[PDB]
């Protein structure tokens, strides 16, 4: 699937059903909702940054070269620009993990529909299933709800293949 | 003092006349606890203390380094460069802040990705 | 023939989000953690005006510099504002100690 769908503004991952009756864009509810739950929890958990406690820390040379100041200075300046870099990495990290998580959900749904349909359809296009037989609106729901049944439409589909075979 | 028994010495050495005076005058301080004694003894080069600030209502504050006027707006926050009344977790403005104020990061942008790659048509 | 197609979401969010592999990647939805919004005029905090020390340095206010004497019995301040490069108060020739302390 190398092309995005603008019409699927309800959820991320969706199916474009096409029957003799018509064509629509139906999002998969469980995939989108579960993914949204996981992504949101990642976001809120990443926020936890738990900076070091405010240990009321400051010193200075005290006119006697008490570099505790330049030590404590570096220590705070060195904790930042290190944690900041480290945090930039964690953002970039989580960014990719969300992106590949998305690609994985795509491929999982495509395998779901392949497993149900099997040889009752042709894999054609960028993730499109051309039904040899006619999947009714209900039948389209059954594939979506995971309740599709191969045998009922099997024989009809088989004869159609043999016609073009 | 209680602990700061700071027996000091002047030093006869400076640079050119600053504002018409070549010599220097380093000043000092000490936070003093109640019922504590401050034994000052000197026989020269000493600028003795005659007035002092009684610390009262100790409360969170800081020392802001900027040249900006006063606002007529009770804003939940102040930073050397201005104020902030939002909720985003982190800042890039300035570490020095007042009470309620997001944390400070030196990054130019920190955006977490929560959606798909936006590829229209 | 009857067909079913698979697809992901796409909107018009120009939001750019960087990754380890790529940068300036436009995503459909994103969250921002940093922010650069500041008015520029130093306002108030919780209804508590600050000790805007105008020109006189913090040392001068403490050391009682004759110029800028107006700030002596000012009531409690939520914070203290010092202009950088204090010009009016030269605090005289001298080096304060344990300063940032």
């Amino acid at each position: 699937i190398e092309g995005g769908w603008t019409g699927m503004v309800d959820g991320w991952y969706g199916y474009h059903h096409q029957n003799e009756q018509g064509s629509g864009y139906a999002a998969d509810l469980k995939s989108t909702q579960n993914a949204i739950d996981g992504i949101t929890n990642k976001v809120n958990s990443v926020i936890e940054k738990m900076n070091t406690q405010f240990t009321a820390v400051g010193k200075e040379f005290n006119h006697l070269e008490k570099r505790i100041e330049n030590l404590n200075k570096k220590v705070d300046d060195g904790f930042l620009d290190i944690w900041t870099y480290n945090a930039e990495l964690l953002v970039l990290l989580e960014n990719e993990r969300t992106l590949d998580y998305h690609d994985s959900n795509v491929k999982n749904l495509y395998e779901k529909v392949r497993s149900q349909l099997k040889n009752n359809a042709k894999e054609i296009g960028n993730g499109c299933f051309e039904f040899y037989h006619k999947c009714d609106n209900t039948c389209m729901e059954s594939v979506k709800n995971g309740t599709y049944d191969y045998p009922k439409y099997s024989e009809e589909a088989k004869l159609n293949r043999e016609e073009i075979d | 003092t209680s602990t700061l028994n700071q027996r000091l010495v002047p030093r006869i050495a400076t640079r050119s006349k600053v504002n018409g005076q070549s010599g220097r005058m380093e000043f000092f301080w000490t936070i003093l606890k109640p019922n504590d004694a401050i034994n000052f003894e000197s026989n020269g080069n000493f600028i003795a203390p005659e007035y002092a600030y009684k610390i009262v209502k100790k409360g969170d504050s800081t020392i802001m380094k900027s040249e900006l006027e006063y606002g007529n707006c009770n804003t939940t926050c102040q930073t050397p460069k201005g104020a902030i009344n939002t909720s985003l977790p982190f800042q890039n403005i300035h570490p020095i802040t007042i009470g309620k104020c997001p944390k400070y990061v030196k990054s130019t942008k920190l955006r977490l990705a929560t959606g798909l790659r936006n590829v229209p048509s | 023939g009857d067909t079913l197609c698979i697809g992901y979401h796409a909107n018009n969010s120009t939001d750019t989000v960087d990754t380890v592999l790529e940068k300036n990647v436009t995503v459909t939805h994103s969250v921002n953690l940093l922010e650069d919004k500041h008015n520029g005029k130093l306002c108030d905090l919780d209804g508590v005006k600050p000790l805007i020390l105008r020109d006189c340095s913090v040392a001068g206010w403490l050391l009682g510099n004759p110029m800028c004497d107006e700030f002596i019995n000012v009531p409690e301040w939520s914070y203290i504002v010092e202009k950088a490069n204090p010009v009016n108060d030269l605090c005289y020739p001298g080096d304060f100690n344990d300063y940032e302390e």
Partner: antibody
Amino acid sequence: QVQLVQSGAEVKKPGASVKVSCKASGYSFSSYGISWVRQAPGQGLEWMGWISAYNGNTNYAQKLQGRVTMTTDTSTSTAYMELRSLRSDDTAVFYCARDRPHILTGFDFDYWGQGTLVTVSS
Amino acid sequence: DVVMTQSPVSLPVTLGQPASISCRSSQGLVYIDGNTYLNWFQQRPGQSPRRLIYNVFTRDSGVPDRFSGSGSGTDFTLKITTVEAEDVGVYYCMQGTHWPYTFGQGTKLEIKR
């Protein structure tokens, strides 16, 4: 503008189905969703469910999942909440509120309805 | 599941005494959209609930400037200056971004003292 008209007050016996209707207008009904809230007599506010007119995405509250059935008539822009099984404890007043339809988008109970109280005792 | 704890349930006030109502969540309340979601509500007794602050920092069209939603982390607050008389009533936190939507308990106001 703001017009979330709830149904009339309803009185039933335990174990009978109840049907509340919230008819909406005076404001664009662009698939905007509708959620239903319950306030026990002089007690807390408990969210019961949400339905997206854009889709059929119901989210009945775990506590009450089997009994509760929610519907939408886009043509009349009317939502419906139906509690199949009734209880004396369920006796309360029910409230409606608009919600955003897309799960991707957040929620907005911008408009609230007229409280349909429902009494359930033998 | 989400737990919205409302700290000051009982809140008597005197006219013109900015008072605050604190809502504390069990988990962070940010969402994929990007914005937090704690639209405060007010149900003036005898009337149906009303909305105040959209998200965490957005006053509603017909809301007095007195009402102000605040807070960034799990602990959010709502402070109304010049507490007036229609201001009295019950208030609830907003449902968490989690689909478990949680209004939490209520906070009641008094006219004077």
